Design a protein around this nucleic acid. Structure first.
Ligand SMILES: [Mg+2]
Ligand SMILES: [Mg+2]
Ligand SMILES: [Mg+2]
Ligand SMILES: [Mg+2]
Length: 1298
RNA sequence: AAUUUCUACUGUUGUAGAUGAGAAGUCAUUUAAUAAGGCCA
DNA sequence: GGCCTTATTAAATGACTTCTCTAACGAGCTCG
DNA sequence: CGAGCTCGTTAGAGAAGT
């Protein structure tokens, strides 16, 4: 089993705890004000990360725009990029790695050739030194305040007179930023990290520009349509300026053209953010002010030719927009809307609109309401001619169809039955071989279908109706007579909300977005949608000024000096509905769990004894209780070597901590020091090895020297030379190494570990209890208690894991050989109060339970039970890192150790396998090493202890609440915590099965192209069961198992590779194999049949060729069902060997019919056998003899016959069915090669799948079962072939039992 | 309806499982409004 | 009355990929 | 005008890898 597989690689956690202020430390903290001046150092510290990240926005516009013109190296990259995608053994990446790095070393040459890069990451930024004004407060002071710039106009920072004060108040707090200046050494890294601006250009925006021009010279090919470069280039001209061409020299302000935009030499203008919001506006498009329509772009002009002209494959020249530049305040060029700030807008902006609608009198003396009851009433008495009245055949007409007529296809199929008889004769002049498109035939797409073409065409529509009183023109004509009644539903609903537009008329309230207004937003929202939906019923008469070539439609008489004057006021629900929707939908700002300083920039950066007057944080132990003492700033030497001797008594075991961090960085820090090199005495040759870097393979040389070779002829150099004195330091003589010895020791990596593996000492020194209480009462120590609900007295049973780790830091089983090394840089926090004090369950009165299996219905409870006591209290927290498996950290070549484990521990290893999705969120199936499954249950109902709750319906209830919250502007409730708490039940249920049944759990692949658009489902546990199973078998401790035994707390299970990324993961994360998607669910389990046919009814003549390919299509005399018994060798794409005998004995099912419109409303049911006997009754083909009846089927040609028999073959092949109840939708197998009795999974035994989704996990665990067959026979061909192609997969499934 | 935190609980000032935190950056998605379009037994 | 496409804007959530898990020396400093 | 003092800084291996 997995029992020799503990202590494999180091890890890290962060144990959280509460800190209870003991004694009068809470009296001392709140006396000075060490929390009231600490929410002013996380609210006034994130301001100084928005001032330093705005000096990086006047350095990232100088490292990419003003310099960095990487010319003609681009073509050397582009030649080896497109060539690389075809085929590559080992050569095409040699030039590709060279062409990648050579572009980077010109971007990262202005890294080390600028003045603003050394004085950017240290003290010289904020406050440099006495006598020097520092480069960030110099950049802000004279260049901005005395210059002309106001660039703090978009923040919570007011101006720049105030923004110097945030920076200057961190004087002395420069090492507080040492984790922020390591996130700005990542923006400029010349390495393969995605935070870098040299990865954003070379590995994001450049290959997304090579394929962005390879899909444009293939767009001049195959498609020269009317893309914008015919006349329409007044639109995208302000974003085609490009003040310097990069095929030639400078050109002042000429408008570029699309030929010299996708030139490879002009990528060097697509570097900064001002030239990516000037390239995505090419591809995307933009809106303007005083607009009529949209200014389109190349990925929109391809849409209007792809679908509008033909049936298409031109969608796949969809050109990507380029990713933004790191740290960049992006621009739009697309009219961002003037978003509002508080609640005094939403009841004044919304209030001033309906003041202007209901109380507007024109210069022609009318109102908006009494000129649709007066002007659309003139449509009844025909006072206006019905030919200058125009609909708009895009959607407002077809929306008017199934609003008046209860059918969409009335006005559509009444001009269809009018254009074929009136404007066209019965001569049938070119029906198909003509235009039939938007140019000559569809003259009403962009143009306006007249009501004169509706008046005497609906009158012609009723000439062939069934009943007499049917749909005709005066029902359309009287709807718009009833449209100014919605004018009276608004402005009476607005007078209805006169009492809730006054409970929010106060500036800066910001309360409509609270959940206390969740039922009053509903009154504000549904007053907008009585105006939004009103102005989709006047979007039928709208003349959009997009005038075509002299095709001015004649329409003037009292219908557009009237309608477009009153539609012009009511069209302001573009700037009313979105200034409000974007304000309500935002979450309200919760309070912060800010970080505790106690006036110390290095608070608990280290626990070491030598640094405690600098760190000021000590740990204690008193009777299995743990204590956090934080010394005062002023009184920091109150635990020195003197005060422990004068107070050595009985009580708090104070913790003595010894640490040697970074033996690469530390042993040549003190030995080769510029203070005490004379004491360690390096020889004449050691002092140049640290210069020439001979002791390293790839280590840096000291300045002014050159890297020599590690192991040319001196691999045995450092053994007898570079090993001098660790046992001469005053403190560090505690090690006892496994010294070099010329035979027993490799390179300098294996010494700097054995320093750090042994450079950790934890010892205990008693302090008398009367002294600790004396400094706490005085003000010289802030003692807290590290409290975790298992350190309480009432802890009956098993504790947590983040308690059973913390007890195991300070143990004595631990410190014999350290597994649980405590770390530094721990954080202290203070979460304020969130939930109010409402008791809701008072004393001693009974409370009804929530379990029907529970042999109890009430509970007494002498004490109260407030709702959330976590959040009714102002708490102190303590995030504390650990470094589990400390002296073992080999995290490399992990997966070959498992593939050598499973090569020996085969025939005893089972295959867990999980299907994600919606019908089952997960579905394990413990398939053993022969196929015959053992356990099988959904992970929908989980928690087998005493509850058995159903999270599949809990998560679906959040989806239907989240999606309702988005569409009702309610608060979107976070589904990730319910899903984290659901999966914790699953993972533990997995983790028990991994050890009890020896699993090698295998998922479906789900390439990231799938799961991006599978985020439509919100209950789906894609990416999330696997990420919470890799990091949960990285360290798998069993609370039942004995402390220091195999799966215990010291020795715990490590069964995944260390989770670095998914990118360098592949298809083996330890034991978490992946298998690729497709053809897992649709397979008969007992035989192995698949859906390798695809009838679609393309033509009629080749349909005769389709049903001639079968071997025989016969009725069975002996039993009574049809057969389509064939072989697949006589078919097109990929022949799978096997003679299939598919049948129609099983009664198949649901075909997904459609009631009024399409896309999966309802279901059906049809039997296959009794559907084609009807078809052998409609035609003269008989079947009583029982032989080959193939030739009779191919003879009788019909439009009906070969469009129906394929649609029955698209139903016998449909195996996943069995709706109408949605109760474990089973499978029917056609072939059944065993005895002819089919596989119907309702009547399935224990060791077969039970529904359709149990057949996915039976085959994810079956293509993942031949992974375990390769590994069982794997050898010196170490190229581990985990990728499978379904040519042997289909071979292995079918030939299983044999 | 009690938690370092989350989920389910009453298991009785708690019970069972899980818990890698901080910071920075980006990306993906959903919904809505808008724009131009396509299709339907 | 539905479904889908290409975009743009705004709001949300979810989730990826990087850095760190540090004691000791040396300026730089106030003080004498 | 050197005493320590005290915070910003400095020291700077090594291996696998859609
Ligand atoms: Mg440039
Ligand atoms: Mg316990
Ligand atoms: Mg527990
Ligand atoms: Mg709960």
């Amino acid at each position: 089993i997995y029992q020799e597989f503990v202590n494999k690689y180091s890890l890290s956690k962060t144990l959280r705890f509460e800190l209870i202020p003991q004694g009068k430390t809470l009296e001392n903290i709140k006396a000075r004000g060490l929390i009231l001046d600490d929410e002013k150092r996380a609210k006034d510290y994130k301001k100084a990360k928005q001032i330093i990240d705005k000096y990086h926005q006047f350095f990232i516009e100088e490292i990419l725009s003003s310099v960095c013109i990487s010319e003609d190296l681009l073509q050397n990259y582009s030649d080896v990029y497109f060539k690389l995608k075809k085929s590559d053994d080992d050569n095409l990446q040699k030039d590709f790695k060279s062409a990648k790095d050579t572009i980077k070393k010109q971007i990262s040459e202005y890294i080390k050739d600028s003045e603003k890069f050394k004085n950017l990451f240290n003290q010289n930024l904020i406050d440099a030194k006495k006598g020097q004004e520092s480069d960030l407060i110099l950049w802000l002071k004279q260049s901005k305040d005395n210059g002309i710039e106001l660039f703090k106009a978009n923040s919570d920072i007011t101006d720049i007179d105030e923004a110097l004060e945030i920076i200057k108040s961190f004087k002395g707090w420069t090492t507080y930023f040492k984790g922020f200046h390591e996130n700005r050494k990542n923006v400029y890294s010349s390495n393969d990290i995605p935070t870098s601006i040299i990865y954003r250009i070379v590995d994001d925006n450049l290959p997304k520009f090579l394929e962005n021009k390879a899909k444009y010279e293939s767009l001049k090919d195959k498609a020269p349509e009317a893309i914008n470069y015919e006349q329409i280039k007044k639109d995208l001209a302000e974003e085609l300026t490009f003040d310097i061409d990069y095929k030639t020299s400078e050109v002042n302000q000429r408008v570029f053209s699309l030929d010299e935009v996708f030139e490879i030499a002009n990528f060097n203008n697509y570097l900064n953010q001002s030239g990516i919001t000037k390239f995505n506006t090419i591809i995307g498009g933009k809106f303007v002010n005083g607009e009529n329509t949209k200014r389109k772009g190349i990925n929109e002009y391809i849409n209007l030719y792809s679908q509008q002209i033909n049936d298409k494959t031109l969608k796949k020249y969809k050109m990507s927009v380029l990713f933004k530049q790191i740290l960049s305040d992006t621009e739009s060029k697309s009219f961002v809307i003037d978003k509002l700030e508080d609640d005094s807008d939403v009841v004044t902006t919304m209030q001033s609109f309906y003041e202007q609608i209901a109380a507007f009198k024109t210069v022609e003396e009318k109102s908006i309401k009494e000129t649709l009851s007066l002007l659309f009433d003139d449509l009844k008495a025909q006072k206006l001619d019905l030919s200058k009245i125009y609909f708009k055949n895009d959607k407002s007409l077809t929306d008017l169809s199934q609003q008046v007529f209860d059918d969409y296809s009335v006005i559509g199929t009444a001009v269809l039955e009018y254009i074929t008889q009136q404007i066209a004769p019965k001569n049938l002049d070119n029906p198909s071989k003509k235009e039939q498109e938007l140019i000559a035939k569809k003259t009403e797409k962009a143009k306006y279908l007249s009501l004169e073409t509706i008046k005497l065409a609906l009158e012609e529509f009723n000439k062939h109706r069934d009943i007499d009183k049917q749909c005709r023109f005066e029902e359309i004509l009287a709807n718009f007579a009833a449209i100014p009644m919605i004018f009276d539903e608004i402005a009476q609903n607005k007078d209805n909300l006169a009492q809730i537009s006054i409970k929010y008329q106060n500036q800066g309230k910001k309360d409509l977005l609270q959940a206390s207004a969740e039922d009053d937003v509903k009154a504000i929202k549904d007053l907008l949608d009585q105006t939004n939906n009103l102005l989709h019923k006047l979007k039928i008469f709208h003349i959009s000024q997009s005038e075509d070539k002299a095709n001015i439609l004649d329409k003037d008489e009292h219908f557009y000096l009237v309608f477009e004057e009153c539609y012009f006021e009511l069209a302001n629900i573009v700037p009313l509905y979105n200034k409000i929707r974007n304000y309500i939908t935002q979450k309200p700002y919760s309070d912060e769990k800010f970080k505790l300083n106690f006036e110390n920039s290095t608070l608990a950066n280290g626990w070491d004894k030598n640094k405690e007057p600098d760190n000021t944080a000590i740990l204690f132990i008193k009777d299995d209780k743990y204590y956090l003492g934080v010394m005062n700033k002023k009184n920091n030497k109150i635990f020195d070597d003197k005060a422990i001797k004068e107070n050595k008594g009985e009580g708090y075991k104070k913790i003595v901590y010894k640490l040697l961090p970074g033996a690469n960085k530390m042993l040549p820090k003190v030995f080769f020091s510029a203070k005490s090199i004379k004491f360690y005495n390096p020889s004449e040759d050691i002092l140049r090895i640290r210069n020439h870097s001979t002791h390293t393979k790839n280590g840096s040389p000291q300045k002014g020297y050159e890297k020599f070779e590690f192991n040319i002829e001196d691999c045995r150099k450092f053994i007898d030379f570079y090993k001098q004195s660790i046992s001469k330091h005053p403190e560090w003589k505690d090690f006892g190494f496994r010294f070099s010895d010329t035979q027993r020791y490799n390179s300098i990596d294996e010494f700097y570990r054995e320093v750090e593996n042994q450079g950790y000492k934890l010892t205990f020194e008693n302090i008398s209890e009367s002294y600790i209480d004396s400094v706490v009462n005085q003000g010289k120590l802030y003692l807290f208690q590290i409290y975790n609900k298992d350190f309480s007295a009432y802890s009956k049973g098993r504790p947590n894991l983040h308690t059973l780790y913390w007890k195991a830091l300070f143990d004595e089983r631990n410190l014999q050989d350290v597994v649980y090394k405590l770390n530094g840089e721990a954080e202290l926090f203070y979460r304020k109060q969130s939930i109010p004090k409402k008791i809701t369950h008072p004393a001693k009165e009974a409370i009804a339970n929530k379990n029907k299996d529970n042999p109890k219905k009430e509970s007494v409870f002498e004490y109260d039970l407030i709702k959330d006591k976590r959040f009714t209290e102002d708490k102190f927290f303590f995030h504390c890192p650990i470094t589990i498996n400390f002296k073992s950290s080999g995290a490399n070549k992990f997966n070959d150790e498992i593939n050598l484990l499973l090569k020996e521990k085969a025939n005893d290893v089972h295959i867990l396998s999980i299907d994600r999705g919606e019908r089952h969120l997960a579905y394990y199936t413990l398939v053993d090493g022969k196929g015959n499954i053992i356990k099988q249950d959904t992970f929908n109902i989980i928690g087998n202890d005493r509850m058995k709750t159903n999270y599949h319906d809990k998560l679906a209830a959040i989806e239907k609440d989240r999606d309702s919250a988005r569409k009702d502007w309610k608060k979107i409730n976070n589904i990730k915590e319910m899903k984290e708490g659901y999966l914790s039940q699953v993972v533990h249920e997995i983790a028990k099965l991994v050890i009890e049944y020896n699993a090698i759990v295998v998922f479906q692949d789900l390439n990231f192209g799938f799961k991006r658009g599978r985020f439509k489902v919100e209950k789906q546990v894609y990416q999330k069961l696997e990420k919470m199973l890799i990091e949960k078998l990285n360290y798998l401790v069993f609370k039942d198992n004995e402390f220091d035994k195999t799966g215990g707390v010291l020795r715990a299970y490590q069964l995944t590779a260390p989770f670095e990324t998914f990118k360098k993961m592949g298809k083996q994360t330890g034991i978490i194999y992946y298998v690729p998607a497709g053809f897992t669910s649709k397979i008969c389990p007992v035989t192995g049949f698949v859906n390798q046919l695809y009838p679609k009814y393309e033509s009629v003549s080749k349909s005769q060729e389709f049903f001639s390919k079968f071997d025989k299509i016969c009725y069975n005399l002996d039993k009574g069902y049809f057969e389509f018994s064939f072989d697949y060798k006589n078919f097109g794409d990929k022949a799978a060997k096997g003679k299939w005998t598919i049948a129609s004995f099983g009664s198949r099912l649901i075909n997904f019919r459609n009631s009024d419109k399409n896309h999966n409303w309802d279901t059906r049911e049809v039997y296959p056998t009794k559907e084609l006997e009807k078809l052998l009754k409609d035609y003269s083909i008989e079947y009583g003899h029982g032989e080959c009846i193939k030739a009779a089927i191919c003879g009788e040609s019909d439009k009906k016959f070969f469009a129906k028999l394929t649609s029955v073959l698209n139903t016998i092949l449909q195996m996943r069915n069995s709706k109408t109840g949605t109760e474990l939708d089973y499978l029917i197998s056609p072939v059944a090669d065993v005895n002819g009795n089919f596989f119907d999974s309702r009547q399935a035994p224990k060791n077969m799948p039970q529904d359709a989704d149990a057949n996915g996990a039976y085959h994810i665990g079956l293509k993942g079962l031949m992974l375990l067959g390769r590994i069982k026979n794997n050898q010196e061909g170490k190229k581990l072939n985990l990728v499978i192609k379904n040519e042997e997969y289909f071979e292995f499934v079918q030939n299983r039992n044999n």
